Amino acid sequence: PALTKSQTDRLEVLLNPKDESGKPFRELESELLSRRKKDLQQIYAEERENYLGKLEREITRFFVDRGFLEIKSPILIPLEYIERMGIDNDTELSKQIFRVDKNFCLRPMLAPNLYNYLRKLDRALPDPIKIFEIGPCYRKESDGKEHLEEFTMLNFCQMGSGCTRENLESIITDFLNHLGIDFKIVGGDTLDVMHGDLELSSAVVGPIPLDREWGIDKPWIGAGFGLERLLKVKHDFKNIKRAARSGSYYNGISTNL
Amino acid sequence: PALTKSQTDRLEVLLNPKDESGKPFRELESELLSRRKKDLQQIYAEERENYLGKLEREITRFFVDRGFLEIKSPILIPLEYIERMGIDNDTELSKQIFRVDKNFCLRPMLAPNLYNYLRKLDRALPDPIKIFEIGPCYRKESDGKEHLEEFTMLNFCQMGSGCTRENLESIITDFLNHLGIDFKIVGGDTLDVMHGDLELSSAVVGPIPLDREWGIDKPWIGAGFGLERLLKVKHDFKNIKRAARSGSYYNGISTNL
Ligand SMILES: Nc1ncnc2c1ncn2[C@@H]1O[C@H](COP(=O)(O)OP(=O)(O)NP(=O)(O)O)[C@@H](O)[C@H]1O
Ligand SMILES: Nc1ncnc2c1ncn2[C@@H]1O[C@H](COP(=O)(O)OP(=O)(O)NP(=O)(O)O)[C@@H](O)[C@H]1O
Ligand SMILES: CC(C)(C)OC(=O)NCCCC[C@H](N)C(=O)O
Ligand SMILES: CC(C)(C)OC(=O)NCCCC[C@H](N)C(=O)O
Ligand SMILES: [Mg+2]
Ligand SMILES: [Mg+2]
Ligand SMILES: [Mg+2]
Ligand SMILES: [Mg+2]
Numbered sequence: 001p002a003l004t005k006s007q008t009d010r011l012e013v014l015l016n017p018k019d020e021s022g023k024p025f026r027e028l029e030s031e032l033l034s035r036r037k038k039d040l041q042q043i044y045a046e047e048r049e050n051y052l053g054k055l056e057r058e059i060t061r062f063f064v065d066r067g068f069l070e071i072k073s074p075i076l077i078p079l080e081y082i083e084r085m086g087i088d089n090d091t092e093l094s095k096q097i098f099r100v101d102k103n104f105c106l107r108p109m110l111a112p113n114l115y116n117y118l119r120k121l122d123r124a125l126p127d128p129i130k131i132f133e134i135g136p137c138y139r140k141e142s143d144g145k146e147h148l149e150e151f152t153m154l155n156f157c158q159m160g161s162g163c164t165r166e167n168l169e170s171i172i173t174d175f176l177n178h179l180g181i182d183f184k185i186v187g188g189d190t191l192d193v194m195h196g197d198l199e200l201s202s203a204v205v206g207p208i209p210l211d212r213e214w215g216i217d218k219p220w221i222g223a224g225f226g227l228e229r230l231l232k233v234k235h236d237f238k239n240i241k242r243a244a245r246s247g248s249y250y251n252g253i254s255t256n257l
Numbered sequence: 258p259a260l261t262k263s264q265t266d267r268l269e270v271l272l273n274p275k276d277e278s279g280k281p282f283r284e285l286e287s288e289l290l291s292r293r294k295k296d297l298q299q300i301y302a303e304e305r306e307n308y309l310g311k312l313e314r315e316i317t318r319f320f321v322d323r324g325f326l327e328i329k330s331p332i333l334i335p336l337e338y339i340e341r342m343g344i345d346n347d348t349e350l351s352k353q354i355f356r357v358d359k360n361f362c363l364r365p366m367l368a369p370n371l372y373n374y375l376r377k378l379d380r381a382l383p384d385p386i387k388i389f390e391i392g393p394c395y396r397k398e399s400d401g402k403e404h405l406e407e408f409t410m411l412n413f414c415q416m417g418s419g420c421t422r423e424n425l426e427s428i429i430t431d432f433l434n435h436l437g438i439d440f441k442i443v444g445g446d447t448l449d450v451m452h453g454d455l456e457l458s459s460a461v462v463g464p465i466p467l468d469r470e471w472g473i474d475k476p477w478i479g480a481g482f483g484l485e486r487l488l489k490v491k492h493d494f495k496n497i498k499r500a501a502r503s504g505s506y507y508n509g510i511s512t513n514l
Contacts, residue, residue: 037381043326044382049317050327057314060306069300070307074502075332075393076355076363076407098333100355100363106333116504120512124294125301136332136393150333245331247373255377 003028013254017236036253043251051235051243051251052152055227056134059154062178063132066171068156069121071133073113079105081112084213096139098149106138110155110224115214118159122218128163132156134227136245146198148228148244157222165189165205168221172203181233193223195233201225260285270511274493293510300508308492308500308508309409312484313391316411319435320389323428325413326378328390330370336362338369341470353396355406363395367412367481372471375416379475385420389413391484393502403455405485405501414479422446422462425478429460438490450480452490458482 003011007025014032016039064070079097082105087093098106107113110133121129134154141147156171169185172193176183183193183200188208193201203223211217231243235252242252249255260268264282271289273296321327336354339362344350355363364370367390378386391411398404413428426442429450433440440450440457445465450458460480468474488500492509499509506512 040378040381041383048321048324048326050329052329053317053327057317060310060314064305067305069305069507070310071507072307072309072502073504074407076395098357100357106357113504117512120504120514121297124297124512124514126298138333150331245329247330247370247377250326250328255374255381257377257381 012238013256016252017238033257036257039253040250040255040257043253051231052227052245055231056152058179059134059227062175063130063156066130068130068132068158069125071114071117071131072135073110073117073133075107075136076100076104077107077112079103082108085109085112086210086213093139096141098138098140107136108139109137110135110153112214114155114157114222115216118157118220119215122159127218128158128160130156130158144239144241146229146232146240148240150245152227152245153224154227155222155224157220159206159216159220160218163206163219163221165191165221168203168205168223171221172201172223176200179230179234181230191223193225195229198229198233200229200233269495270513273509274495290514293514296510297507297512297514300510308488309484309502312488313409315436316391316484319432320387320413323387325387325389325415326382328371328374328388329392330367330374330390332364332393333357333361334364334369336360339365342366342369343467343470350396353398355395355397364393365396366394367392367410369471371412371414371479372473375414375477376472379416384475385415385417387413387415401496401498403486403489403497405497407502409484409502410481411484412479412481414477416463416473416477417475420463420476420478422448422478425460425462425480428478429458429480433457436487436491438487448480450482452486455486455490457486457490 003025011028011032014029014036060070082097093108097108100106114131114133117131118129132155134152136150137153138150141149172185183195186192186194189205191203192199201223206220228240228243232240237243237252242249260282268285268289271286271293317327339354350365354365357363371388371390374388375386389412391409393407394410395407398406429442440452443449443451446462448460449456458480463477485497485500489497494500494509499506
């Protein structure tokens, strides 16, 4: 008669935001099953593009058109970069690092590599230097509703001329308005782009003391966004896992049919 | 008078395939330096796209237009997948795995995830099932002229109808001809796509015994290509490192100016 918690969980997996009690579990499940196969079949026939990939390409076109240089840096970076990022056994991050071998780890952020690119490009390109990168990042997490251990990050930044908070907020605003994501900006000067109680991004207006360790000596602005969180808001997924790289979902549809 | 080996190495770093002795090192280096800044400045003004990223997008459009489903699976996979891929302490791969924690490792290939997608999608999509994925892979290597420890792989495959060697070679041929890469196909049936003595890809025509461990029971074809190797051939880089994710090069130009 009444659906068990476990049965409800299974139904929620097959449930899509677009869908609209009483009937038995087997009926409800068969209904949802035929629907997802249908959605999957539609993707396969018409678009065939992966949400995460499609988003990355959409973000790339956005910044490339706005004068930012597309960067693809190593995902596997030296542990030494962590220490130099000011990540000591005093911050939360220190306990979220996935170590590899004895000298490396999985980048928990894009900052270090972008820092290097800013210093190096400054010697070859005209002010201001504008770069961005979209790629995998890794952190050990306790949560699983707004956090993934393997997520995708977007970090763009400008160094030199025009690096003001107003300009930064202008970029943030044009970006999210372009993607159709509702947000509110709240807040070296630091800002947080929020959607409800979900943190979409953290932005900072430099210069900041840490800049010196990386050979940076000019003002700059920048923000980092989690692609899965943007996907979560846009497609209204209730759980961040439906947007993550995985073998359990495809464009938010359960592959366990 | 004569350039030292070390000076030659430095010049080669700044050297591009398009360029055309006697003069002193400082002169030669200053000449090359102004040239690279120029190239970099041109990229920044006109295109702004990263080679590796641009290639991925070009590969994606290719297969998407040809009916293949774009997949983005986890880069950090379970070690159990390695064992199930038939990778024992009998093969070379067993010694090339980058372990993470006690139960995970960095995917040294895309096979396991794609295997799962084939089994699952088979229950929802019409035959044949066509999928592909482009993403980072990791292997410990002794070489550094044709091997990277962090490289990018493309693996496409079709399961069900039309899975013949002829069709496989046809896909391979249209693909490389599209990218403008010279090659020769040589060779469960297995093929190697070569460029000189450089292995561009390994393709296999199933079914193969390993299929059973993953719940696969239909014929299939597929090939895996290294994106950095394709870039190496296309842009004529002498060293694979100029195409790799890095902080030392950008679209093959040295960032150490
Ligand atoms: N574990 C994660 N899973 C998914 N996205 C993440 C994760 N960690 C960070 N992000 C995204 O990356 C953005 C910038 O990173 P960062 O500012 O370090 O996040 P945080 O401050 O760790 N956020 P949070 O853990 O939710 O309090 C965050 O605002 C998120 O959009
Ligand atoms: N270490 C690497 N660096 C760059 N590309 C690689 C690397 N390993 C494999 N690839 C690419 O991935 C393709 C398919 O993988 P695989 O067939 O396992 O390579 P392999 O057989 O290990 N090739 P090789 O190591 O040169 O003899 C190879 O043909 C290369 O194009
Ligand atoms: C200075 C630092 C590391 C905080 O930020 C950068 O160097 N670059 C981009 C910053 C993006 C905001 C925030 N640092 C993030 O992790 O997303
Ligand atoms: C069966 C197996 C694992 C060898 O291949 C696949 O399951 N899928 C794609 C194969 C691509 C060729 C080769 N396996 C490679 O690693 O590129
Ligand atoms: Mg956190
Ligand atoms: Mg934050
Ligand atoms: Mg090998
Ligand atoms: Mg091979």
